[PDB]
């Protein structure tokens, strides 16, 4: 694929000394650069990875895609309450295949609705088609045939072959309603576009267009007898078998009763018609030289013989080859292929193309796959999964995840993790450790986010990511709501300071009970010793209990020392007296600042009061 | 997403993203550091600061772990390399947002890059120059980011003649958490791995046969989910080279060749990595970028080509 | 963990297994003599436990024995199972010369026990002194 | 959907924001009255024509203006008196009381409070004394004041990305500020030529901090991107009578609600504004319909009937 | 007989929220017994997970933490409801078999013990009432009961109340075929209920009154309930097949009773004639033997169809004639 880098400004020209283009990946798949090491060439180009899919339409897509996915419980999984588990595990999975087939339709629509370009829509569509034929093929009777079950497999099928392709349009109904030089309806076009909707199962479209020139005109007049056929042969249109196979026995009984009884009978109209109406009677009867005959493409000869000759896929390799041969393989849409490789049972090698189409459908794709046992890991076999080791299905959405993760999209990401240790096989060790290396990407902005990201990590065990991320949190009210050990002393340090100087936060220490509960630690514990040795201060024994907290907390820990001082100082027994000798025994730039700020030498001082202090106790 | 003006007078020599992609490290010969800012409201790119950092061409920056502040470093042709942190206190534009918190002159000779190592190794760092020896440092205690020490010289060419203005060196550290330390180094036409020995010293575990010129870039990739490393070069003989490198003449280190390609006709210079080493890119003379993933056999082919 | 998590902690394991001396207790155990003094010990004559105190040291001595059989016999199959290869694997491997004290022939710890028929007699013999943990 | 008649004229509704992580859908409203000598700011439960329950009230002097949660707990109103006043919830004994007030919020004499929005701890108002607002929980003056900001009536106010603000004036203004700015004068100017038709409504976009809506004197809605010129990039016609207010669905804003004057509230759905199938959903008998509040499936307006509407089931 | 109550609700339990974990099932964890362990440790890989995401891990722990504690609660009392339930089950069997060897094993008079007998009607009334389509363990116990219980049968009061009950129990099996509920086993015993009650009691102005309000109920369901039936013949079981097969014949003959039929009517919409006459080919390979008595009770229901006036027309348009030539049987 080639794209072109920026459609505006192109940094090159002629092949004027082949300039050195240099290019980096950016963390965001929206979001890379371009650039160029020459003169006069100082541009920046922000350039995004080609076809990458940042729309809102495509993550719900995604999310819905993994709810199939994440719903499907053990059953995304395939065992190589007895005979039943068999049967159940296809129902279940059948019925997935059908949830991923809506929430393609759903995306594509909002695709069709909200858009700049519609070339999307038309690829989705297309994977829609190629997978309805899938489950039509392998997604209803489960290997048996379509006496198992006629209702659903017939519904599918007339769902799926009318909404591959959009025609009979309104838009060509009218075109022949329209167009002369033929009295009335009865040219080839006519008949050829009421056969056409028989063979699509478009029945009641197919009665409108009779009832709508000749039924009771030309016919009810010219001849009674065509008449009675073409009125009761509407009429078993009208009642065609869609639950019973038994019914339909009955019913291609009444048809080819009909078709024999017109068949040899009286011809009071034009030599044309004639034929016009047995052709119509032979095509609802079944014949394949006729089903044939007025087929435009192979899917609509293939649809016929399901519905008018056998009900049966025992056929469908006759029944394909015979409509190939009246109509081969349109390559100009990319589904036809893909639905005659699927009904001629090679059903593999469809995975890299599709994930060439869109990388998500391809990862469930194979998921579903992998689930009803179409595919398998064959491999046999050093320590992880992102390989061939596993499934080829495991490996797509593995790389779906990893994907995921550079889109930046914090929607998708528990999708991606989600997805990671869903994941089938791989050990949980295996998984700890991928998820070990992705987590620490996810765009976290809310609480919430890094809320779900811790949860992640105590869900898988990851401390040392849990303890990393919160370090980048880390880096004055951002600090108190910090409150390794070496940041811890410096806060330490910084409270012990703030309080030599000398407010909820303070109290809570000594909304406000959920905080109380939040935080029901040295550091802490010495700050909220401080205020309340400060509190004290502000309510004599009481404060003879304050000083010698404070001598206490100093033998713990020079700045503090020298604030003690100066506290000791403003203040002017035996026990008193043995903390100021511990004091003097344990007795720098910034030190004498906070001297002369308190001044506003210092050894002298604090020898002169401790003098002054002993004579006190002397006195006593 | 239209192109902008770097606001360099002399020619850009490398561009580089923070770890959230949102932000991105400008330096080029002006002697001048640039920072873009991606504004979250109306999305384009916009200048957070400018300024003049060396006395020479600075070749080489990168970003340091988010868990250790906003840390930048420079290389340049003066023979240094700077740190610098952001000071959120100042006003964007003013030239004064990030203060030098250091400088190491032990080089001798210029220097062609510089490169930090993985979080999970603390605050650390390698560069190499014309003198050809490989200097990794370390700041020992996180709390001072100005404490940086010099924790190992390596003499990774031997010979380097007095009379050649055609040199080129590359660094890339492995960004895998779950392996032994170790980084690739690319000189002239060689290409040397080194792994921390037992002995906390590095040791030569490996090299990267086949270049037949100038690497002019090299990358190690991001190895979360695989047990092997790969490691890509584009080289002046216009070859992108993918190495798959498996721990199991004195290694412990297998190389296997998995790719080459010449889909560039003339010399790729650039060579870059996804964030999850899913997608690997190249770019080169014929003004074209090229975006490559793995088969499933573990080949590589082109997705898409930008020009 | 070698299946699963990683191959760090499995060096822990290792150490663990092959430095506790539970497998040489264990190897012992297969012993003839341990068992034979064993039985000898629990096999006293019944004046003695009756005229005895509940405090008396042959009461302990008993109680232990069967606390120590009981443990053997609940830990055979755990060690045997993931025990005695890995130490084979490592004495292969490594160098160590250690003597074997075991009998190849008792394959189980009842091998060496099922040769003793007053032991069952004994026991229910014991069950008239009224020790309750005895009994 | 259902109407209760409360025996007041509703100037104002208001969901009560859902615990963090809730799994239910809104069930607790509050409402204001106006144009009554006593005046309430009253909460109401629907419980499981509906079941309501006034859980409490309180009298509030002057009409209600505007009306916002804040928190859980707390309710912001703006009086015709120009007092903002801070409501706090008690619910274990189903009361409210008044937790903090600024009675000198907008005053020329008295000039009505015309407009509240919050981002807690932020709250910033507007009125027609042209002032501007912000307020910070527990902090007795303004963090600022814009003195003097507009010369004409300033009828609305939303955050775009705080401290960045949008207002909306009586001559068709959305005007841009920032309290840390410098002077009395907006950063942005944004109009439609010819009518000056006054905005009386505004709500900023969920997801695209850039893009607002607003409502006007003529009835019509507005589509802005304040980074695409000065003209709206859509203008579309809607009710006969003015449009009172405008809001963005939450959690899915190609839905999109407006009431008016006229008697109707339309449910708009575009499922991008930049880059549309309308529903009526009050009956053809209906007086203004002055305030809606939406959240999730749950919708709730009040009427100069003395009417509530509610539905809990818009889209089922 | 006091084990027997629904007031309990040992079935329902309380959900709680669960805003987070909700994805955590017990896979792994299940004899239904679901270990502990197995939700253990998956819940606290998820935990490292989001710890390791560092988005707000601090607060959101204690949430997880009380979510664990109520989920291990949960798994206990799950386990709990199983064993008590399990339980209950043994206890009704048991008590099931006692009953049912006393009743046969019984030489006294009957007259005395028919008071027991309606006292053990009224008593199984409410439980079969509870448990009429629940669950289909404890009716199969209470089902055959009554079968056999109908089969082994002043005055004039004794006679009332068994009269209204047998049609109160008449309603309850009606309704549970309509819906297909249970399996093919007990789906049987409810044919020979209805079968001997159409038969013996409704079969003078006390036998109009009965009549008529019978032809009621079965018009309630309509073609709900004849289909179920219809689908129960020609199937995998035997027993049920055969019950199914001699139910309608029940049916239409008391329906004639009360020219034509509606019974007979629905049976030709449902399809019903026309597979059944597809079926008499190849007879002969059909024909003590189980399979013996089962093609009985189907040409004997043919015979019925051919006695009404309005059945010669449904009949004759199955080309009856053609289908038993290819049989070869004559």
Redesign the interface.
Same mark, same amino acid.
């Given at each position: 694929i080639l794209v072109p880098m920026t459609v505006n400004d192109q940094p090159i020209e002629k092949n004027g000394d082949k300039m050195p283009l240099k290019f980096k990946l950016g963390p965001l798949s929206y979001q890379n650069m371009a650039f160029i090491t020459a003169k006069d060439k100082y541009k920046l180009y922000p350039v995004r990875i080609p076809r990458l899919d940042t729309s809102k339409e495509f993550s719900a897509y995604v999310s819905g895609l993994f709810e199939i996915y994440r719903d499907l419980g053990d059953d995304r999984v395939f065992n190589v309450v007895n005979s039943n588990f068999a049967k159940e595990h296809n129902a279940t999975v059948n019925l997935a295949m059908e949830a991923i087939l809506n929430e393609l339709e759903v995306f594509i629509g909002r695709v069709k609705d909200q858009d700049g370009r519609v070339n999307r829509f038309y690829e989705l569509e297309e994977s829609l088609t190629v997978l309805n034929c899938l489950r039509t093929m392998y997604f209803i009777l489960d290997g048996q045939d379509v006496e198992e079950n006629r209702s659903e497999f017939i519904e599918s099928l007339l769902n799926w072959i009318n909404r591959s392709d959009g025609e009979p349009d309104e838009e060509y109904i009218e075109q022949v309603f329209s167009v002369a030089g033929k009295k009335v309806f009865e040219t080839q076009y006519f008949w050829k576009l009421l056969n056409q909707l028989v063979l699509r199962g478009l029945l009641s479209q197919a009665i409108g267009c009779i009832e709508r020139s000749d039924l009771l005109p030309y016919l009810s007049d010219t001849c009674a007898v065509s008449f009675d056929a073409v009125s009761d042969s509407i009429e078993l249109l009208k009642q065609y078998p869609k639950d019973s196979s038994s019914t339909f026995r009955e019913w291609k009984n009444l048809v080819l009763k009909l078709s024999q009884a017109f068949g040899s009978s009286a011809t009071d109209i034009s030599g044309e018609l004639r034929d016009y109406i047995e052709d119509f009677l032979l095509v609802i009867g079944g014949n394949q030289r006729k089903i044939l005959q007025y087929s435009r493409t192979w899917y609509e000869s293939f649809c016929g013989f399901l519905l008018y000759y056998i009900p049966s896929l025992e056929l469908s390799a006759e029944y394909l080859q015979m409509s190939l041969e009246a109509n081969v393989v349109d390559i100009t849409n990319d589904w036809e292929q893909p639905c005659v490789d699927i009904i001629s049972g090679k059903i593999h090698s469809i995975l890299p193309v599709m994930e060439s189409l869109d990388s998500c459908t391809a990862a469930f794709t194979a998921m579903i796959c992998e689930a009803k046992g179409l595919i398998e890991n064959i491999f046999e076999g050093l320590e992880d999964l992102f390989s061939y080791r596993n499934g080829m299905a495991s490996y797509m959405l593995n790389s779906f995840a990893f994907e995921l993760c550079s889109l930046g999209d914090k929607e998708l990401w528990p999708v991606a993790i989600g997805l990671i240790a869903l994941s089938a096989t791989g050990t949980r060790s295996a998984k700890k450790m991928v998820i070990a290396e992705l987590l620490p990407h996810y765009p976290f902005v809310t609480n919430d986010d890094i809320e779900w990201m811790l949860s992640i990590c105590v869900e898988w065990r990851l401390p040392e990511i849990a303890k990393e991320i919160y370090t980048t949190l880390g880096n004055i009210e951002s600090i108190a709501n910090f409150s390794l050990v070496k940041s811890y002393s410096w806060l330490l340090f910084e409270a012990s300071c703030m309080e030599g100087q000398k407010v909820l936060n303070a109290i809570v220490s000594k909304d406000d009970v959920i905080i109380p509960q939040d935080i029901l630690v040295t550091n802490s514990m010495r700050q909220t010793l401080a205020p309340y040795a400060v509190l004290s201060q502000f309510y004599d024994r009481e404060d003879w209990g304050q000083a010698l907290r404070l001598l206490l907390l100093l033998i713990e820990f020079h700045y503090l020392v020298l604030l003690v001082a100066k506290f000791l100082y403003p203040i002017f027994e035996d026990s008193v007296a043995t903390v100021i000798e511990v004091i003097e025994t344990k007795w720098s730039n910034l030190y004498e600042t906070i001297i002369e700020a308190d001044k506003s030498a210092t050894l002298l001082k604090n020898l002169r009061k401790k003098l002054n202090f002993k004579l006190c106790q002397a006195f006593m | 997403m239209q192109p902008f003006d770097s606001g360099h007078d002399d020619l850009v020599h490398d561009v580089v993203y923070d770890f959230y992609g949102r932000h991105v490290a400008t330096c080029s010969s002006d002697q001048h550091i640039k920072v873009f800012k991606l504004d979250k409201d109306t999305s384009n790119w916009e200048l957070s600061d400018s300024w003049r950092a060396h006395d020479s061409s600075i070749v080489a920056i990168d970003w340091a772990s988010p868990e250790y502040g906003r840390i930048i470093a420079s290389a340049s042709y003066d023979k240094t390399v700077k740190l610098w942190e952001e000071d959120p206190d100042q006003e964007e534009c003013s030239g004064r947002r990030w203060n030098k918190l250091c400088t190491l002159n032990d080089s001798k000779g210029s220097l062609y890059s510089v490169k930090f190592a993985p979080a999970h190794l603390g605050l650390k760092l390698a560069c190499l120059g014309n003198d050809g020896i490989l200097r990794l440092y370390d700041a020992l205690e996180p709390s001072d980011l100005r404490s940086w020490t010099l924790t190992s010289e390596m003499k990774v060419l031997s010979i380097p003649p007095a009379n050649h203005l055609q040199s080129d060196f590359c660094l890339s550290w492995c960004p895998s958490r779950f392996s032994p330390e170790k980084l690739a180094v690319s000189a002239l036409e060689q290409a040397i791995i080194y792994q921390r020995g037992k002995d906390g010293k590095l040791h030569v575990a490996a090299k990267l046969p086949g270049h037949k010129s100038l690497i002019r870039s090299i990358s190690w990739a991001p190895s979360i989910g695989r047990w092997y490393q790969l490691i890509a070069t584009g080289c002046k003989d216009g070859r992108i080279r993918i190495f798959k490198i498996t721990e199991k003449l004195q290694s412990n280190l297998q190389v296997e060749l998995l790719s080459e390609h010449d889909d560039h006709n003339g010399e790729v210079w650039s060579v870059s990595w996804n964030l999850t080493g899913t997608i690997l890119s190249s770019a080169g003379d014929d003004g074209k970028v090229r975006l490559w993933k793995a088969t499933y056999s573990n080949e590589f082919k082109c997705m898409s080509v930008i020009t | 963990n070698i299946s699963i998590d990683d191959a760090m902690a499995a060096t822990n394991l290792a150490t663990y297994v092959r430095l506790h001396p539970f497998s040489r207790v264990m190897e012992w155990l297969f012993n003839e003599k341990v068992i034979t003094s064993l039985i000898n010990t629990i096999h006293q004559d019944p004046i003695s436990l009756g005229s005895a105190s509940p405090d008396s040291p042959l009461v302990v001595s008993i109680l232990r024995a069967i606390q120590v059989m009981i443990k053997a016999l609940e830990l055979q199959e755990t060690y045997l199972h993931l025990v005695r290869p890995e130490v084979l694997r490592y004495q292969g491997e490594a160098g160590v010369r250690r003597k074997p004290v075991a009998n190849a022939a008792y394959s189980a710890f009842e091998d060496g026990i099922l040769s003793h028929l007053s032991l069952v007699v004994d026991l229910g013999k014991y069950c008239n002194l009224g020790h309750a943990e005895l009994t | 959907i259902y109407a209760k008649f409360v025996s007041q004229k509703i100037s104002k509704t208001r969901w009560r924001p859902l615990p963090?992580? %809730? &799994?239910q859908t809104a069930e607790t409203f509050a409402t204001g009255s106006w144009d009554n000598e006593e005046n309430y700011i009253s909460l109401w439960s629907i419980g499981d024509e509906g079941d309501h329950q006034l859980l409490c009230d309180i009298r509030h002097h002057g009409d209600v203006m505007d009306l916002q949660f804040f928190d859980q707990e707390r309710i912001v109103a703006a009086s015709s008196t120009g007092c903002v006043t801070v409501f706090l919830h008690h619910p274990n004994n189903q009361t409210l009381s008044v937790n903090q007030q600024w009675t000198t919020a907008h005053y020329h004499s008295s000039a009505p409070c015309t407009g509240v929005v919050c981002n807690n701890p932020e709250i910033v108002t507007v009125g027609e004394d042209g002032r501007i607002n912000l307020f910070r929980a527990d902090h007795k003056e303004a963090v600022r004041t814009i003195d003097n900001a507009d010369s004409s009536t300033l009828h609305a106010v939303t955050f &775009? =990305?705080t401290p960045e603000i949008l207002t909306v004036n009586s001559i068709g203004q959305l005007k841009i500020w920032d309290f840390r700015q410098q002077g009395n004068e907006p950063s942005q100017i944004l109009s439609l030529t010819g009518d000056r038709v006054p905005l009386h409504c505004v709500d900023r976009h969920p997801n695209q901090?850039?893009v607002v809506a607003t409502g006007g004197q003529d009835g019509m809605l507005s589509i802005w991107d304040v =980074?695409q010129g000065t003209m709206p990039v859509s203008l579309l016609k809607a009710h006969e009578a003015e449009m009172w207010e405008v809001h963005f669905h939450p959690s899915n804003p190609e839905h999109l609600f407006t009431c008016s004057e006229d008697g109707s509230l339309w449910h708009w759905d575009a %499922?991008?504004w930049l880059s549309i199938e309308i529903t009526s959903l009050l009956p053809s008998r209906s007086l203004s319909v002055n305030t809606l509040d939406v959240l999730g499936p749950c919708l709730v307006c009040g009427t100069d009937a003395e009417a509530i509407y509610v539905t809990r089931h818009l889209f089922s | 007989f006091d084990f027997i109550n629904t007031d309990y609700k040992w079935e329902e339990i309380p959900s709680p929220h669960f805003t987070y974990l909700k994805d955590l099932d017990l896979g792994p964890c299940i004899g239904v017994h679901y270990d502990i362990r197995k939700a253990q440790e998956i819940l606290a890989l998820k935990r490292k997970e989001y710890e390791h995401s560092q988005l707000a891990t601090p607060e959101f722990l204690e949430t997880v933490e009380l979510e664990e504690k109520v989920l291990i609660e949960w798994l206990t009392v799950r386990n709990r409801a199983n064993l008590l339930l399990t339980a209950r089950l043994n206890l009704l069997q048991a008590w099931a078999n006692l009953l049912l060897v006393m009743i046969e094993s019984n030489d006294f008079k009957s007259t005395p013990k028919m008071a027991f007998l309606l006292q053990a009607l009224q008593a199984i009334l409410p439980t079969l009432e509870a448990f009429s389509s629940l669950k289909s363990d404890e009716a199969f116990e209470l089902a055959r009961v009554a079968k056999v219980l109908l089969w082994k049968l002043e005055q004039f009061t004794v006679g009332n109340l068994i009269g209204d009950k047998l049609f109160q129990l008449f309603q309850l099996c009606l309704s549970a075929i309509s819906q297909c509920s249970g399996t093919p086993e007990l789906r049987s015993l409810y044919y020979s209920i209805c079968y001997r009650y159409l038969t013996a009691v409704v079969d003078t102005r006390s036998v109009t009154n009965a009549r008529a309000r019978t032809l009621k109920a079965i018009t309630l369901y309509g073609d709900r309930l004849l289909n179920v039936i219809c689908d129960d013949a020609y199937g995998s079981d035997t027993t049920c097949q055969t019950a199914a097969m001699i139910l309608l014949n029940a049916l239409v003959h008391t329906s004639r009773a009360s020219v034509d039929c509606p019974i007979i009517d629905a049976l030709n919409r449902l399809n019903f004639i026309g597979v059944l006459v597809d079926s008499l080919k190849e007879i002969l390979n059909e024909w003590a033997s189980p399979s013996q008595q089962y093609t009985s009770a189907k040409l004997a229901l043919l015979l019925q169809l051919c006695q009404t006036r309005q059945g010669a027309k449904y009949v004759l348009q199955a080309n009856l004639f053609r289908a038993l030539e290819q049989s070869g049987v004559f």
């Open positions: - | - | - | 963090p992580g %809730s &799994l &775009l =990305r901090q850039h =980074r %499922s991008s | -």
